[PDB]
Design a protein around this ligand. Structure first.
Ligand SMILES: [Ca+2]
Lengths: 223, 4
């Protein structure tokens, strides 16, 4: 997260870190056994880390649970990032509490101008690299589809939206991928891609979760 | 453009 702020320990209780010996992506807890992340985050050997704040120090409240299933959307395209969504089933159920909590899925899509909370442990610099210990947060609005397509001509599908700031300085970044965009208490987006981070005229692009609510439900019910 |  570039141009954000320290969230505060456990103030985003649905945020998870996906770890393979290091933090590599975010995700969102949607029930005690399932996490939503980005398809581009798929790999073998995922450990889901819940209840995290400082990802480099064991502080209390953490639950580390291996992924038992990682299900990329069948129509995920690794070149366009269309359908950039994955479900992870936990090997055992997380213990839910005030610091480890699910986030609701949308019942309808969000409109342009809706303010959302985007969070992660990704890079905090628009040029070069700095990875934070603690979770960072950014409040950002959903942009109009016209503005999104103007910024990314030929690259925005019906399964994407833009959020953030055209003036530069505030965005998600590498290491935030897979993490949440929450708006009025619903998980409306997944950190997906963009042209650099926090660059002028190049807002973040996010997977449009409202298009996948039925797919998520059917996939969980069958697994 | 790159994944995040
Ligand atoms: Ca920790």
């Amino acid at each position: 997260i570039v141009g954000g702020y320290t969230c505060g320990a456990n103030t985003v209780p649905y945020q998870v870190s996906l770890n393979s010996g290091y933090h590599f992506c975010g995700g969102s807890l949607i029930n005690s056994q399932w996490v939503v992340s980005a398809a581009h985050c798929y790999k073998s050997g995922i450990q889901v880390r819940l209840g995290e704040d400082n990802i480099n120090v064991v502080e209390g409240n953490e639950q580390f649970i291996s992924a038992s299933k990682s299900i990329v959307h069948p129509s995920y395209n690794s070149n366009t990032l269309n359908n950039d969504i994955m479900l992870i089933k936990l090997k055992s159920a997380a213990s839910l509490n005030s610091r480890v909590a699910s986030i609701s899925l949308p019942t309808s899509c969000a409109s342009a101008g809706t303010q959302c909370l985007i969070s992660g442990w990704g890079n905090t610099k628009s040029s070069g690299t700095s990875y934070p210990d603690v979770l960072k947060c950014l409040k950002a609005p959903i942009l109009s589809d016209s503005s999104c397509k103007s910024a990314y001509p030929g690259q925005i599908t019906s399964n994407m939206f833009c959020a953030g700031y055209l003036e530069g300085g505030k965005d998600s970044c590498q290491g935030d991928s897979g993490g949440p965009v929450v708006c009025s208490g619903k998980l409306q987006g997944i950190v997906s891609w963009g042209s650099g981070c926090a660059q002028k005229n190049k807002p973040g692009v996010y997977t449009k979760v409202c298009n996948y609510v039925s797919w998520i439900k059917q996939t969980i019910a069958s697994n | 453009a790159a994944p995040x």
